[PDB]
Design a protein around this ligand. Structure first.
Ligand SMILES: Cc1cc(N2CC[C@@](C#N)(C3CC3)C2=O)cc(NC(=O)Cc2ccccc2)n1
Ligand code: PRO
Ligand SMILES: [Cl-]
Length: 489
């Protein structure tokens, strides 16, 4: 059985590749930026999909399916894939593969919305989209084709639309923190980073300590009336006056899995939080030749049935052609959070040996105690994974006053929280300056595939105090808010 041999804290990229290949999460493909999602990864996607779909159904959002193609003139009302032929017959007008579906959906919204009684209109779809960039792709985190949901709502007032933006952003916080045990920071995107055409974009941002990079985990946009004006989406009040609708859109992708993998993995391979692990407990029988193997396997089956009564997801690995040691490594690499070992000694004592994946700590638990204690143990693992990741997030953010402090902090692979005047031009200049200083540094390093530019990640909702005369860290103008910056995906 393959072991992960790269160390997470020494060659992070090689570590990540080994962890996702050797655990059978991914397979490569002959078109660049496209990868195969194998069942071990797909199962985790199914779990978060089900969580989020159930939660938005409770909000009255209904699923739908809109075409994957969009006409040139509807899309252009650059990073798009264009279809131009069927067989060898040219199309009269090329058609694009969707990168996002506002321009596919909103002509229909304009047809469907007639009066205030048609609102709010709330739709979602689960599908894949294509964003054909040429920069370095990374499995799960940044790919040419990815799976996502996208929700699109329309409301009679801005207040109700904004309320929904924030309710969805809270569901994305729960997707990452409660399901995947990944801490995130809620905030607003800067004017240069917000969705094209929208009014205000909110985000949850995550952090990869090993390469210092922030990453946008999910996004929820107040489109306001901008798209309603573009698509003539209006409704009548009760006396017949026409008004524009107020819109949101929001989306979360398979990037989430990658974030999870990078957050919790260790030098042995994956560590999957128990709430989304497709196998929570793997039972490994010890099978000597000189034992009553039928009695040991019979007890493993009884324990499996007992655990499944508490809804624990259990597999018995009773393969005779591998040793227990081999199986220990096999399921460690795959990130199963609990292993249960049962041999003749255990049978005789009425106990089982349980080993937790995150710490390696082992417990002896009586069969009667097994189901409640495992449940307690899985909640403790989930909580411990989250708290440890949150401590690394906090340790990864430096509060600074002045631009002179930026390069030392980025050299420590940290994010910076700085007072900023929020001038869009300033962000563009900071990106270019940090980028050129990073190139110099790389040459002093004797070194390289992603950009060294520092950009804004999010103006966090939770704002530290801003003292009276605080200046912006780059311009010296009056600072308006604390903003989180870093290198990023
Ligand atoms: C897997 C994944 C995710 C996401 N993005 C975007 C923001 C967002 C968020 N939040 C979406 C709105 C929901 C997200 O997850 C984007 C992508 N590829 C790309 O940009 C294309 C690409 C390919 C190679 C290199 C550089 C760029 N690939
Ligand atoms: O691509 C985006 O960011 C928005 C949210 C999902 C639909 N379009
Ligand atoms: Cl479905």
């Amino acid at each position: 059985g393959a072991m992960v041999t790269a160390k997470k804290d020494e060659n992070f990229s090689e570590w990540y590749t080994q962890a996702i290949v050797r655990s059978e999460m991914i397979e490569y493909y002959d078109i660049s930026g496209c990868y195969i999602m194998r069942p071990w990864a797909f199962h985790i996607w199914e779990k978060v999909q089900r969580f989020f779909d159930d939660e938005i159904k409770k909000m009255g959002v209904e699923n739908s399916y809109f075409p994957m193609f969009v006409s040139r003139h509807k899309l252009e009302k650059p990073e798009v894939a264009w279809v131009t032929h069927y067989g060898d017959s040219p199309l009269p007008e090329k058609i694009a593969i969707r990168p996002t579906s506002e321009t596919i959906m909103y002509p229909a919204y304009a047809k469907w919305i007639r009066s205030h009684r048609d609102l709010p209109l709330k739709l979602n779809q689960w599908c894949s989209v294509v964003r054909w960039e040429f920069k370095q792709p990374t499995p799960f985190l940044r790919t040419r084709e990815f799976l996502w949901q996208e929700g699109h709502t329309a409301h009679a007032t801005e207040e109700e639309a904004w309320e929904l933006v924030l309710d969805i952003l809270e569901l994305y916080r729960r997707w990452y923190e409660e399901c995947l045990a990944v801490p995130v920071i809620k905030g607003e995107k800067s004017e240069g980073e917000k969705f094209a055409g929208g009014k205000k974009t909110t985000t949850v941002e995550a952090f990869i300590p090993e390469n210092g990079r922030g990453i946008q985990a999910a996004t929820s946009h107040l489109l306001g009336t901008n798209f309603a004006k573009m698509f003539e989406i209006e409704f009548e009040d009760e006396e017949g006056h026409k008004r524009l609708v107020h819109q949101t859109s929001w989306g979360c992708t398979t990037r989430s899995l990658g974030v999870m993998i990078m957050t919790h993995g260790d030098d042995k391979g994956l560590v999957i939080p128990p709430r989304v692990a497709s196998v929570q407990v793997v039972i490994i029988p010890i099978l000597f030749k000189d034992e009553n193997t039928g009695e040991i396997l019979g007890k493993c089956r009884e324990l499996k049935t007992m655990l499944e009564k508490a809804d624990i997801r259990v597999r018995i690995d009773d393969r005779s052609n591998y040793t227990p040691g081999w199986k220990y490594n096999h399921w460690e690499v795959k990130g199963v959070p609990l292993r249960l070992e049962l041999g003749p000694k255990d049978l005789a004592k009425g106990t089982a040996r349980v080993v937790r994946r995150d710490t390696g700590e082992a417990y002896q638990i009586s069969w009667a105690d097994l189901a409640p204690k495992l449940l307690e143990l899985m909640e403790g693992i989930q909580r411990s994974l989250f708290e440890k990741a949150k401590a690394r997030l906090h340790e990864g953010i430096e509060k600074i006053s002045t631009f002179d402090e930026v390069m030392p902090a980025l050299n420590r692979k940290h994010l910076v929280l700085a007072p900023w005047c929020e001038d869009p031009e300033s962000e563009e200049q900071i990106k270019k300056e940090t980028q050129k200083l990073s190139e110099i540094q790389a040459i002093e390093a004797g070194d390289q595939v992603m950009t060294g530019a520092m950009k804004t990640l999010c103006i966090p909702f939770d704002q530290p105090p801003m003292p009276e005369g605080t200046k912006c860290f780059y311009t010296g103008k009056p600072a308006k808010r604390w903003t989180l910056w870093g290198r990023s995906y």
